[PDB]
A = this chain, B = another copy of it.
Amino acid sequence: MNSFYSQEELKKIGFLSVGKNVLISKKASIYNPGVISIGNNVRIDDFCILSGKVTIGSYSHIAAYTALYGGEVGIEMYDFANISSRTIVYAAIDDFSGNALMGPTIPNQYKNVKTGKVILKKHVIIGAHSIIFPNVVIGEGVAVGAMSMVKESLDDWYIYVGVPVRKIKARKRKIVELENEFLKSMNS
C-alpha cells in the first residue's frame, strides 16, 4: 500500500507552490502550507511535520518522522538534498542557559530565541535520528552521520559524525558526475 495524497488532494492543500510527482503522506502534518514551496520529484513520509516557512527543491526524500520547523526565517533544501528518518531541523530554538524562560506557553519578551535560516545545499544527506540547529548552512555535498547534532555551519564536501559533529573524512564528488548524467538522460 501507500499513504500518499492524490494530485486532487494535493491541490486542495494550498501550498505556496508544489511541483510534479510529489508524494506526501496523508499521515504527515503540514502546518501553514501557504508558506511551503516544494519542487518536483519529492517524497515526504509518514509522521513528518512540516511547519512554518519551508522550501524544498527537486529530487528530495524527507523520510518518516522528520520534523522541519521553519518558523519565520525558514528552512531551505536545494536539489538532491535528502533527510533520513527521525531528523529534526529547527530554524528557531530557546535558550537553554537559564537566562530566559522557554517555549510556546511564554510570551516573547521573556525568552531569548535564537533563529536564523537553515540551508541544506545540493547533495546534502542528513543521516537518521539527527538534529540541526538554527542559522546553519550545511555546505554542498556534506553528509552527516546517524545520530548527529549540528549546531554550526558545515564546510562543503565532508562527512561529519557525532554529538556535536566533527569532520571525519572527505565526501567524494562522483555524485556530481552522476547528477549531470541523470539529468542529461532526462533531456534526450
Contact = CB atoms under 8 A, between A and B. Distances in A.
Interface of A: 1-3, 27, 29-33, 41-43, 46-47, 49, 58-61, 64-65, 67, 80, 82, 85-86, 88, 94, 96-107, 110, 123, 125, 127-129, 131, 141, 143, 145-147, 149, 157, 159, 162-163, 170-175, 178-179, 181-182
A78 to B, nearest CB: 14
Copies in the complex: 3
Contact of A182 (B42, B67, B107, B146): B107
A127 B86 contact: no
Nearest to A162: B163
Nearest to A61: B103
Contacts of A99: 172, 174-175
Contacts of A170: 98
B101 A175 contact: yes
7 nearest A-B pairs in the assembled complex, by CB-CB distance:
A98-B172, A98-B171, A61-B103, A41-B105, A82-B103, A59-B105, A99-B174
Interface SS majority for chain A = loop
A66 to B, nearest CB: 10
